Amino acid sequence: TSIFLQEWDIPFEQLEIGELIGKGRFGQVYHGRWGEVAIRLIDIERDNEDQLKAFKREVMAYRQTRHENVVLFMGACMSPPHLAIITSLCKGRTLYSVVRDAKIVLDVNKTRQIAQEIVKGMGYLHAKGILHKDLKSKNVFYDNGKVVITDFGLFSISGVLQEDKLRIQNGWLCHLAPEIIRQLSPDTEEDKLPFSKHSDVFALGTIWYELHAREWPFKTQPAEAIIWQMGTGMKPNLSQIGMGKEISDILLFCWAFEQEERPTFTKLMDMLEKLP
């Protein structure tokens, strides 16, 4: 029923909490000092035994992770209603900001390189049987070539959807593979959507689009239009900006309508190697 900070392999004496780094839908995330760290505070029901042990399920898993392309998970302490996830602090900016910054050039060699980093991290997490469930450019950090994946697994315990009208954030729907898109309802619950390794590969496809177009797909369209277009399998390409066939074929594969036709992260890494 409890997770204390002495259960972890990071020797911890004191934890300072500094300013809030930013707003977000799942808890609050502050600067901290341990070196410097990022502290995400979460609120739970005093006795929601269901969700408390569900949460613990996930966090012991994270204790086994260590990989250069995944943010270093450092510890989690429980005391209801207050929970904390402590990770390493990312220097630099999110990939979201970098792509949308006009002063940074993002050539095709570099986009292939960034994409390859994200895939290595994702294949590691998959190899350890951990699904991300919220892969996206606001959850990737880039500092002069170092690329780190963050916030994996959180979505299960997230509650970012929370009468009879489902809340949809800009950017969310275009990362959701069709099998998921076809099941959203105002009764939908984060812990029961049919996420899979295949849905994670789909989400990487949206990032590849975003890397080259420097904007999300379906940028123009309202949510309902996006749901129908994506649910029936209509998808953009990159020919309108002169991207070659090879850079577009990865999208055809990652966004494939039937999941089993989408590649694992291992095969996808190979496909990215073979670009010019």
């Binding site: 809340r167 949809i168 099941q183 309802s185 105002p186 949510a223 129908w228």
Partner: protein, 304 residues
């Protein structure tokens, strides 16, 4: 496309708007919840409705929002709710507008059982006339006409609301809400080019819901229309795109009305009736020259 009794009220509203000067938070006292709250201006004795849209973005974009929003002072019509001003306060932009004491027809339909055909004829003239004004005098389409944004009063006007005046304010919105009642046209769902025809589809669908007392997709079986007289978002929307459109029951409504909605609910927007056609449709020619005390029906059903 001009009347006098209507002529008296428009300047009078303009005269009222003279009162406002400028707006900010402490001028206003929360009266109730309707998100939009009915509030009382103290610098000027007006009772307005003020809607609070939560946006959190740096001022250069917010200044663009308000300049684009300032055009509503200029559109003025007996078929459009009256506008007073838009300012930003404390991470929310406020739009305060004429208050309509009857609410939305969404909200009116909840209290009534179903809305009778002759009143629905009248509301059809109001809505059709509003979009035509907007299209012809401001080159704008509404982009979301449906019952919650059409407002009615005890004085008896029916006017449109919440239309797309500022391309950027829609841009600035972080997140949208999708429930199980959609009024989006088939062509908008498919992401193809669209016009005020999309508003005409939305109007047809709203009319059938109000006439039957139920959102009509999926269509009810024989059991529930008899008594009248668990669905995922994607498959509701796909119903709109691929199944044949809803229709009024053939027994209880005049042919003119049925044909009126059927012309609104044609899937191909090029074949759907456009704005002027409906002004010449048999159904609204009949309804135009009719005597219904709309104010009377309203107050009796809602209790005022």
């Amino acid at each position: 496309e001009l009347d006098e009794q209507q002529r008296k009220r428009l300047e009078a509203f303009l005269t009222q708007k003279q009162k406002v000067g400028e707006l900010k938070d402490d001028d206003f006292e929360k009266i109730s919840e309707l998100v939009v709250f009915k509030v009382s201006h103290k610098p000027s004795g007006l009772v307005m409705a003020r809607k609070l849209i939560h946006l959190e973005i740096k001022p250069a974009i917010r200044n663009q929002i308000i300049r684009e929003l300032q055009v509503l002072h200029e559109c003025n019509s007996p078929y459009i709710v009256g506008f007073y001003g838009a300012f930003y306060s404390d991470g929310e932009i406020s739009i305060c507008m004429e208050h309509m004491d009857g609410g939305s027809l969404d909200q009116v339909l909840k209290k009534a059982g179903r809305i009778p055909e002759q009143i629905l004829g009248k509301v059809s003239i109001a809505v059709i006339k509003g979009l035509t004004y907007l299209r012809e005098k401001h080159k704008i389409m509404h982009r979301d006409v449906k019952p919650s944004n059409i407002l009615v009063n005890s004085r008896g006007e029916i006017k449109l609301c919440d239309f797309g005046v500022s391309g950027q304010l829609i841009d600035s919105m972080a997140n949208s809400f999708v429930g199980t009642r959609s009024y989006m046209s088939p062509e908008r769902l498919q992401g193809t080019h669209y016009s005020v025809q999309s508003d005409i589809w939305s109007m047809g669908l709203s009319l059938v819901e109000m006439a039957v007392g139920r959102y009509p997709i999926p269509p009810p079986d024989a059991k529930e229309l008899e008594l009248m007289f668990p669905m995922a978002i994607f498959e509701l929307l796909d119903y709109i795109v691929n199944e044949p459109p809803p229709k009024l029951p053939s027994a209880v409504f005049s042919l003119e009305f049925q044909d009126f909605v059927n012309k609104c609910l044609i899937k191909n927007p090029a074949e759907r009736a456009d704005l002027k056609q409906l002004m010449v449709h048999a159904f609204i020619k009949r309804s135009d020259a009719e005597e219904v005390d709309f104010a009377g029906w309203l107050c009796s059903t809602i209790g005022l």
